[PDB]
Structures are given as C-alpha cells and as structure tokens.
Amino acid sequence: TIRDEIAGCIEKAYEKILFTEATRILFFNTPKKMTDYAKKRGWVLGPNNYYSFASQQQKPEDTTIPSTELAKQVIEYARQLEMIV
Amino acid sequence: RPANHRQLTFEEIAKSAKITVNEVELLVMKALSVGLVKGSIDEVDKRVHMTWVQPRVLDLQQIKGMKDRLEFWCTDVKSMEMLVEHQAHDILT
Amino acid sequence: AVQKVVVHPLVLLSVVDHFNRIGKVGNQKRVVGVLLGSWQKKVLDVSNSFAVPFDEDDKDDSVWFLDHDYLENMYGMFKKVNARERIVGWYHTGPKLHKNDIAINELMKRYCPNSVLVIIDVKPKDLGLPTEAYISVEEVHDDGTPTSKTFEHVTSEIGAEEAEEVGVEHLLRDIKDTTVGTLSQRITNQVHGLKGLNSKLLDIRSYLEKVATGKLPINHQIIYQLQDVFNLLPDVSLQEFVKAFYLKTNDQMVVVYLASLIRSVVALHNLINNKIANRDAEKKEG
Predict the structure, then answer these.
(1) d(Cα B82, Cα B68) in Å, to the nearest integer?
(2) C-alpha neighbours within 13 Å on the C-beta side of residue C125
(3) Which among B50, B59, B64, B66 is the top mutation candidate for probing chain C, defined by the most C β-carbons within 10 Å of its own β-carbon?
(4) Does the keyword Acetylation apply (chain C)?
(5) Residue C136: which residues within 8 A CB-CB, separation 6 or more?
(6) Which of B80, B84, B91 sits opposite A82 (nearest CB)?
(7) How far apart (Å, rounded) are the C-alpha atoms in residues C145 and C142?
(8) How many CA atoms lie within 13 A of C152 on its CB side?
(9) Looking at chain A, which residue has its C-alpha nearest residue C243?
C-alpha cells in the first residue's frame, strides 16, 4: 500500500526524475519491477528518466453542465418562490 | 473545412493561390472590398480569421449532411426541452 | 411596405360565423370573404370584415367568382355608416394557399393599392399562432424569370381595443393561471421550445420530402442561401462565451442578496405583528 502510494503520487509534478532515486524510493535496484512500473504505469523508460506526459481539461463544452445545473438550480429557486400550494 | 476551427494562416493561401507573401493581403482585402468574405486579419502569424462562407449548391453529400446535422440539432433541442418541461411541469400544473 | 398587420378578434369571429353560414351546404366550399381595415402607418390596422360569394369546381380548377357589385353596394353601406372605415384587402379560410389564390388579389388590386390577405384557420388544431398574412411582391430572378409575383408574409398578431377588451375578457371566464409575475411566462416557456420543435419538424420533413418528390424541387435559390445562413450562425465557441458566466454570477448576485436580505426581514416583521396580536389577544381572550 506504499508501493501503489508512490505509483499514485508519481503522476504529479515529478516532471522528470532520474531513475536511481526512483530505485531508492520505490524499491528493487535493477528489477523487473521497473518494467512493472514503467509499463503497467506510464512514465516512459527513456534515457535515465521517467518522462512526464501532459493532459488537459480545457473546460470547453461546459459552459453547459454549468448551464443545465443552473437550469436545475434556478428552476429550483423559481419553484420555491413559485409555491403557492 | 467544416467551419469550426477554420482560422486560416498565410501558408495555405500562398500554396493554393501560388502567390507570394506580400500579395495575400491584397488578395484578402480585395475579397473584403467585394464582400465575398466577412472576416478579419491578424498579422503576427498572418492568420486571416474566417467568419464567413459562400452559400453553395446542395449536392448529394450536402443533402445527406443537411438532413443528418439538422436532425442532430432537432433531437438535441427536443431532448433538452422535454427535460425542462418535465422538470418544471407539475408547478405549472 | 408593411410593418405588421394588427388583427382584432371581431374579424376572426366574423370568419367563424361565416363558416357557420356556409356550413349547411357542406359539399365543397372554402370560406372566402373581404377584409376591412385602416392603413394607419407602416403598421396596418383591421377593424371589420364581411362576406363574398365564391365557388370553385373540380374540372378545370381555375373557376372562381368575385362579385364586384356585392362589393360596390355593401362597401357603400359600410362607407355610409362609417367613413373612417375603408377597404384594405381580403381573406379566406386558408388550410394553405393553393394555385388559384393569386387571382383574387389580382382582381382587387384595383381597389386597394396593396391588397393584403389574411390566412386563418377555423379548426384550432394549430398549436401555432393563427391569422397568417401575406403580401404580393416581385423578386425577379437571376435565372431570367420574366416576373415572379410571389406573396410574402408580413408578421401578425392580435391587437387590443378598449371595448373589445370588455368583450373578449368577459367572454372567456375560463382560465387564468397567470398571477402575472415569475410564472405568467413559464407556460409560454414550454411553448417556445415546443413550438420551435414543431417548426423544425416541418423543416426536417420538408428536407426529406424535397429529395423524394417535387422531381428536384429543393428550392434552388433559398435552400443554399438560407441553409448557409443557418450554417453560419450556431455560435458554440468557448473562448469568452464561457466568460459570460461571471456576468451570469452577477445576474444571480443581485437577486440572491435582495431575496436573502429583504424577504426574510419582511416575513419576520409579519411574524412580529402576528405574534404580538396573537399573545395580546390571547391574554384578553383566555
């Protein structure tokens, strides 16, 4: 549960890390567990470095889940102000 | 290009029209003078921005894209309107 | 030209009773009558209307009758009783317009310079807005059509008058859910979505129908033109159209703090008055 704890917190701002410090922290000096992490995980086994890929959200379409959750919420405001029985 | 991410740069203009760099501005402002384009121009990248396309004769694939995208809009409007109506229907009553 | 026409309820009821006039012959007869009004402005006004004899048979279906003399003497009557009132056009029942529905206007253009028509529906299955009105103009085409003389619609509604308010608003007595405020518009808020849907259903049905029949109808000018108008304005972009939503937060802001502050205080003050008059009459009652 610490092995997958490093394998969870790897994906953060370790934008590049040299391999033998990950050998120190993870465990197992030159294992096939480096194949396990570098293949079951991402962190492309390049030259002496687990490389960090990039991913984005953009908040593009939504704009609409804001608009429809506001449809829900203001239909609710109007609904409770609406009541009369 | 399907009119969504269509901001054109200098290169494809100078590649299609096969004219040099300092003539594409004349080329686009001539069409802006005529009015068979309704866009605008940045020149840090020489991106000529597109807010326009010409109405063109409906072909068979244009027939199909017409019906398909028109239905695409119609069923979305219907499916959201039904949810609005049903969500606030019983307070109308 | 015309801004819009203003139809009063009296002429529409004057069409309904006219259908009741000719509902006993039954066999094959559309409702056709003559429209009266007042050219007020670029907007148009409608006050009165009346009948006309008209028939149409099956073989050589261009057989149509407009009595000039009926028009002469009965317009003499209506001009004799009211000089403010004069002719503005004509009407008929209008399921739709058929091919023979140009010759009526082409007769009575020598009475009104712009003889406007009104298309209604006596059968209120229309969940749209009745009293359609066209006007005939010319649009002479790039293909070298000599003269295309086409009716074109100018928008319409039902207007108001002080006495007809008394009339209509007493003749209803039927339905009033409005309590005009935040909810007098929500029934019509269902209506605007649903009645964009009906029109769009007509659109998709027409688009599917032009490919099958009409032999190649497809509208040939105003399909690609107004279709590209459609295909030039669904803005779903995401650069600052996202950034209208702190103005949406500002829209929320004012009403949130007005409600939260003043609503609670007013209801509380009324609780104060109620509980004072409750306990101070309780100590006198019990």
Answers:
(1) 21
(2) 2
(3) B66
(4) yes
(5) C102, C105, C115, C149, C150, C151, C152
(6) B91
(7) 7
(8) 12
(9) A63
